[PDB]
Every structure is written in C-alpha cells, then in structure tokens.
C-alpha cells in the first residue's frame, strides 16, 4: 500500500540512474577548489535525480525550485558520504578525485571534514546503509515541508509521509532482525542538517574571500532569494 504511491523501486532507480562512472580514484593546490568543482557538476545531476523521484515533477515549478534550493547541500552531502563508505580516511568526489583527511586538514577544513567522516560516512558504513535507504532519506530531505514560500506545504508533507511509510515497509521486509533500523536511518538527518549548515557557512566564506573558484550553478545556489 505504502509502496504503490511511492515505490522504493523507483527511488532506487533514481539513485542508480545518476551514479558516477569512476574506475580508479586519484588524490585531488586546493582540495576545497576540487570539492567546489564537484559540487557544481553534481548540481546538474541533482536536478535529473529529483525529476526521477515520484511526483516531484508534478509539483508547481516554483515549489520544485524552492525544494531544490532548500535541500541541495544536504542532498549532495548525503550522496558523497554514502559513496565514501568504500574508503577509510577520505571522501570520493563525483569527478573521480579522492580527498584525504590529511589534505582536508592541510587546507583548513579539517573540523567539518572529520564531522562528515564520523557522523555520516562511518555510521553509513557501520549499519551497511543500502542505496534504497539512501535514496529514501534523500527523498525525505527533498520533500521538506518546512521550506519557506511553498504554495502548498501540505502536499509536500504528504509526499514526505509517503516516502517514510515506504522506507519503513522496506526496512521491515529486508531487515526484520533490526527493528530499530528505520529510526536509526531517520536519526542521521539531524547530523546531516547540522553538517549541511556548516558546509554552507564555509561556502559563503569561500565566496566572500574570493580565493576559491565557484562555478555558475554553485554560485546561483549561493544567491539571495
């Protein structure tokens, strides 16, 4: 019943459709420049992902815009964090570059980098969070009914509820031995929110100081409403 109006199969298909094709990673002057180039690249891919999430494209265009402007940073952080469960002390960018812990610290962004590894990557790895679960968490973030200016917040709330009902059913069916798993997935969202806020504070500083190239789409997301 859950699955029919918001099927987890379609959310997984959205994840699998937009995955980068990187055969072998290489280490990234400034890793922050590489991270900002990857973020700009992945904003284009994020729009394609969101179109593939059931019912998103049926929202009013102005509400699609508000949800992606509100969510992009958390959506991108969730994706690169999950991609990075494969490495021990680093993150894997969609551009095929790795950023090592040591490189991040050496660039003056060690503290936030460590939060990503400890609160997101390591926790995703420890519970073996799967791509369906990641996709559902991302769809919950996308359908954020608290986003300011939505024409019909109740319809976004209803889409969020359909995702989390579908995710719970999926978790009970696939992981019946882990009754806490659904709650454990949801309880990564406060850490994601906090880390997203701190990453956005960094990006605004990088823009202010002017010593870090910021490409057109990432720049547009940093513009005032």
């Amino acid at each position: 019943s859950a699955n029919e109006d918001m099927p987890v199969e379609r959310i997984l298909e959205a994840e699998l459709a937009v995955e980068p094709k990187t055969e072998t990673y290489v280490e990234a002057n400034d890793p922050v420049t590489n991270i900002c180039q990857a973020a700009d690249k992945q904003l284009f891919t994020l729009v394609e992902w969101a179109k593939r999430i059931p019912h998103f494209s049926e929202l009013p265009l102005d509400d699609q815009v508000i949800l992606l402007r509100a969510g992009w940073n958390e959506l991108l952080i969730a994706s690169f964090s999950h991609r990075s469960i494969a490495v021990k002390d680093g993150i894997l960018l969609a551009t095929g570059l790795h950023v090592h812990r040591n490189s991040a610290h050496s660039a003056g962004v060690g503290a936030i980098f460590d939060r990503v590894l400890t609160e997101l990557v390591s926790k995703m790895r420890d519970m073996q969070m799967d791509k369906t679960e990641l996709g559902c968490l991302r769809a919950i973030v996308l359908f954020n009914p608290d986003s300011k200016g939505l024409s019909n917040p109740a319809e976004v709330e209803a889409l969020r509820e359909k995702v989390y009902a579908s995710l719970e059913a999926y978790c009970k069916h696939k992981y019946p031995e882990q009754p806490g798993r659904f709650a454990k997935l949801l309880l990564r969202l406060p850490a994601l929110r906090s880390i997203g806020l701190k990453c956005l504070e960094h990006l605004f500083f990088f823009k202010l100081i002017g010593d870090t190239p910021i490409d057109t789409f990432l720049m547009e997301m940093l513009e005032a409403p």
Binding site: F44, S57, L61, Q64, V65, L68, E220, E223
Partner: peptide
C-alpha cells in the same frame, strides 16, 4: 532569479 535551475527543471 534562479536562471539555471528554472532552465534545467523545464526541459522534459
């Protein structure tokens, strides 16, 4: 404003 985002959302 949001020129790029509107363009990418339209194109079906």
């Amino acid at each position: 404003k949001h020129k790029i985002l509107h363009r990418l959302l339209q194109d079906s």
